[PDB]
Amino acid sequence: SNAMLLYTKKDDIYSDIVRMILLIKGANAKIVDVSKEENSKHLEELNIITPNGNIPTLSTDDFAVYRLSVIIEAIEDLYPFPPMFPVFPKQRANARILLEYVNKTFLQNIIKLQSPDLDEKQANEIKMLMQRDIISTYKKIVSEREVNAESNPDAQNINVLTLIITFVFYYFIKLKISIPTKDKNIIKEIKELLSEPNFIKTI
Amino acid sequence: SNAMVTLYTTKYCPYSLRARIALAEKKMSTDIVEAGDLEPAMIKKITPNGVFPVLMEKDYSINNRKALLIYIDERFPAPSLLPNVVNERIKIRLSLDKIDNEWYPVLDQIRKHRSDQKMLESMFKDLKESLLAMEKAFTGSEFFISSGFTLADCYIAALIICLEAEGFIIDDEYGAIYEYKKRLFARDSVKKANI
C-alpha cells in the first residue's frame, strides 16, 4: 500500500528529525534502523538504491531520496497536512537559508563528532565552535517564528526550524556540550521546547 | 522605478545565467544590470558579500545560491517551473541538488585550473566519459526528466553555456543530448541569456 520505507541509523540526528516530522504528518512509514543487524537484508538493498548507502533515505516504490532538505520538501508534497513551511515566498526562502545554516554548522558537525577516529583537539574545537553560534542561532529562529506566525494568525502552520533545533539541543545534551546561557526564560523556553509531546514520542 | 525586481549579474557565471533564464520564463517586468559596470561603492550597498546573482525588489534582497531559483518560481508562480506529478517533482528536487553539487564543481575546476593545458586535456576526457555513458541512459523525453520545462533545465542550460565558453563543446557524438541541447537553445528563455 503506502509502502513508505525510511532507512535510518540509531542516534543519527538526521533520522531522528525525519522520524519526528513523519510522526507529525501522521504518515505511515516503515522505519528501518540499519545499525541493527536484523536488517542486514535492507542494508544490502539500500546500497543498491543510493550512491553511498545514504542515511537517512526515504524510499518509496517510485523513488529513493536522500539529503535532509530534499526529504523535508518531499514530505511536504506527500503529506500536505499540516503545513511545515510558512506561506509567504519571502519567509519560506529565509527559512530555507536558515535551515542550510543550522545544517552546515551543527547538523553535519554533530556527525563528525560521532566518528571514532577524531583527533582529541579536533572536536573540542568543533564543540566550542558550536557553542558560539548556537544562542544567536536560537534567537534568529524565534524572531522569524514570531514574524511568520503574526503575518498569518489563521494559517496555523508549524515551524520546522524550531523542531530541527529542539534536536540540536537534545544532542548538545547527548554529547555533554554545555548550552552557554544565563537568560532565565531562554532556558525555560528550551526546557518546554524539549517537553513537547511528539518530541518525546520520537525518543 | 517600476522594475518590480532587478537582477544584478556577473558575466560567465552560471548562477546568474540560471536566474536570467527563469525570469524570462516568468514573463516578468524586471530590470537587469551588470557588475563591473557599477560603482565599487554601490556594489557593496546592494550585496555586501560579493555573492553574485542578486535579486532585489522593494522590501527584500536575496542571493543565496542554493535558494534563489526556488524563490523566483515561488514568488512569480505562473508558469510553474516544477513538475505537477508529486513523484516527478520530488526527484527533480533531488536531481537539482546532485547537479549543484557534483557537476557545477567540475566547472570551477575547469577554470581555476585552466591556465594549464595538460590537466584540461584529461578533464575534458572525463566530462566526455561521464556524459558518454548517460547520453544513452536518457532519451524519449522532450526536456530533462519531465514533460515540460523544469528548473532542472535552467540549471543545465546555464551550465553548458559556461562550459562551452571554456572550450568544452557538445558534438554530434553524444546523441539525444546534442539535440536536447539544441532544443534547450531553441527556447526564447535560453537565447536572450546566451548573447
Q: Which domain holds residue A61?
A: 1-84+197-203
The answer to whether the CB of B67 falls within 8 A of the CB of A97 is yes
In the block, cell 513551511 appears at A85
Task: Please check whether residue B94 touches A, CB under 8 A.
Answer: yes
Q: Do A138 and A176 share a domain, yes or no?
A: yes
Residue B104: count of CB within 10 angstroms of its CB: 18
Tell me which residue of B58, B49, B63 sits closest to B16, measured CA to CA. B63
Note whether A22 and A48 are same-domain residues.
Answer: yes
- Same-domain check for residues A34 and A72: yes
Q: In what order do the strands lie in the sheet with A57-59?
A: A30-33, A5-8, A57-59, A64-66
Best of A52, A76, A77 to mutate (most B CBs within 10 Å, chain B) = A77
Method: X-ray
Distance of alpha carbon A2 from alpha carbon A27, whole angstroms: 9
Resolution rounded to one decimal, in angstroms:
3.3
- Cell numbers of B79, please? 508558469
CA distance B122 to chain A (A): 24
The CATH number covering residue A152 comes to: 1.20.1050.10
Which among B71, B86, B90 is the nearest to A93, CB-wise? Answer: B71
Task: Give the integer Cα–Cα distance in Å for A109 and A98.
Answer: 16
The domain spans of chain B are 1-82+188-195, 83-187
Contact B15, B40 (CB under 8 A): no
Beta strands in B58-192 (DSSP E): 60-62
B10 burial level (CB within 10 Å; 0-12, 13-18, 19+)? middle
Burial of B22 per CB tally in 10 Å (0-12, 13-18, 19+): buried
Count of CB atoms situated within 10 Å of the CB of B120: 16
Sign of CA dihedral B62, B66, B68, B74: negative
Contact A74, A58 (CB under 8 A): yes
Question: What residue type is assigned to position B185 of the chain?
Answer: F
Question: CB distance from B90 to chain A under 8 Å?
Answer: yes
| Residues of B whose CB is below 8 A from A93 | 62, 64, 67, 70-71, 74
Chain A residues within an 8 Å CB radius of B86 = 77-78
Please give, one letter per residue, the 3-state secondary structure of B7-66.
EEECCCCHHHHHHHHHHHHCCCCEEEEECCCCCCCCHHHHCCCCCCEEEEECCEEECCHH
Count other C-beta atoms under 10 Å from residue A148's C-beta: 22
Q: Name residues 128-187 of chain B within 8 A of A (Cβ).
A: none
| Rounded Cα–Cα distance for residues A37 and A77 (Å) | 32
Contact B19, B72 (CB under 8 A): yes
Give the CATH number of the domain where residue A56 resides.
Answer: 3.40.30.10
| Interface contact flag, B90 A65, Cβ < 8 Å | yes
Q: Does domain B1-82+188-195 have CATH number 3.40.30.10?
A: yes
- Number of domains into which chain A is organized: 2
Chain A residues 33-62 with CB within 8 Å of chain B = 60, 62
* C-alpha closest to that of A70 among A80, A57, A87: A57
CB of A87 less than 8 A from some CB of B = no
Q: Are B132 and B141 in contact (CB under 8 A)?
A: no
Q: How far from the centroid of its chain's Cα atoms is residue A181's Cα?
A: 22
Which residues of chain A have a CB within 8 Å of the CB of B91?
62-63, 65
* Shared domain check, A173 and A143: yes
A79 and A166 together in one domain: no
d(CA B145, CA B180): 11
